Ligand binder design. Structure first.
Ligand SMILES: OC[C@H]1O[C@@H](O[C@H]2[C@H](O)[C@@H](O)[C@H](O)O[C@@H]2CO)[C@H](O)[C@@H](O)[C@H]1O
Ligand SMILES: [Ca+2]
Length: 226
C-alpha cells in the first residue's frame, strides 16, 4: 500500500510518544530441544497469543531513538538487562527473551516518500496506516484486527520486506503498530527513516511519534489524492 490512510484528530496538544506493552517470553522447560519457545513464529502469536504470557508493564510516552543491540553473555539462558532510555522503562527485564508491542501514530515533518527500514533479532512486524494498523481514533475497538504486515523481519529467515516505502502527508497522523520478540540470546531492533528530500537517515523519532484518545465518531484523514 503506497498511499496509506492517515488520520486527522481534533487535538490541540497531541500526546508525545507511543504506547508500549511488555510481556514475558519464557524459555521452555530446561531439557527441551530447542531451548526457546517457538510460539513467536505462530501467525496469531502477535495478535492474541502474547496475551497468554505475563504482562510486565504498560508504558506511555515512548519516543526517541528506540534502536538497540543487546549482546547476551550466553545462549539458552534468561538474563536481565535494561532497555534504552526512549522506552521509559528503567528496571531490568529479561533482555534475552521478551515480547514487546508499540502502538500509536506517526506524524511526518515533510510531505513525500518515506522509506522505513527495519532489522531485528528475533522478530519485528510493522503495520502502518489506518485500517492496516488500526482505525482512526478507534484503536481500542480495532486493536486485534491489524492486516498484512507492511514490513517484517525474522532472524534466520530468507526474510524480506525489511522496508516500507510510502507517500505520506505532513498534515496527517498515521496509525503504526510495531511488534517485537526476542526468543533467546542476542536481541536487536532497528527502525530508520529515509525521506527523498533529506540526505541524512532519521534514527531519533522524538518529534514523530504521538498518541491520541479514541473518540465516538473516529477521526478519518482529511487529505486525499484521487
Ligand atoms: O546469533 C544470534 C542468534 O542466536 C541464537 O542462539 C544460538 C547462538 O547463536 C549460538 O551461539 C548458541 O550456541 O546456540 C544458540 C541457539 O540456542 C538465538 O536463538 C537467536 O534468537 C539469535 O539471537
Ligand atoms: Ca535472539
Amino acid at each position: 500500500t503506497e498511499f496509506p490512510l492517515g488520520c486527522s484528530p481534533n487535538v490541540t496538544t497531541p500526546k508525545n510518544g507511543l504506547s508500549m506493552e511488555l510481556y514475558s517470553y519464557d524459555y521452555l522447560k530446561s531439557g527441551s530441544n530447542p531451548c526457546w519457545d517457538a510460539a513467536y513464529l505462530d501467525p496469531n502469536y502477535p495478535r492474541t497469543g502474547y496475551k497468554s504470557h505475563r504482562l510486565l508493564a504498560k508504558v506511555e510516552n515512548v519516543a526517541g531513538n528506540i534502536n538497540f543491540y543487546y549482546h547476551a553473555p550466553m545462549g539458552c539462558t534468561s538474563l536481565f538487562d535494561t532497555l534504552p532510555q526512549a522506552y521509559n522503562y528503567r528496571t531490568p527485564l529479561t533482555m534475552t527473551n521478551f515480547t514487546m508491542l508499540l502502538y500509536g501514530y506517526f506524524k511526518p515533518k515533510v510531505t513525500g516518500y518515506h522509506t522505513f527500514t527495519i532489522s531485528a533479532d528475533d522478530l519485528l512486524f510493522v503495520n502502518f496506516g489506518a485500517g492496516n494498523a488500526f482505525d482512526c481514533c478507534k484503536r481500542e475497538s480495532s486493536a486485534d484486527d491489524f492486516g498484512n504486515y507492511q514490513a517484517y523481519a525474522v532472524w534466520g529467515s530468507q526474510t524480506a520486506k525489511d522496508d516500507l516505502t510510502v507517500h505520506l502527508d505532513a498534515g496527517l497522523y498515521y496509525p503504526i503498530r510495531i511488534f517485537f520478540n526476542n526468543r533467546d540470546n542476542d536481541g536487536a531492533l532497528s527502525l530508520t527513516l529515509k525521506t527523498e528530500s533529506d540526505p541524512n537517515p532519521v534514527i531519533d523519532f522524538s518529534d514523530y511519534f504521538y498518541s491520541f484518545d479514541d473518540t465516538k465518531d473516529g477521526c478519518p484523514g482529511l487529505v486525499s489524492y484521487d
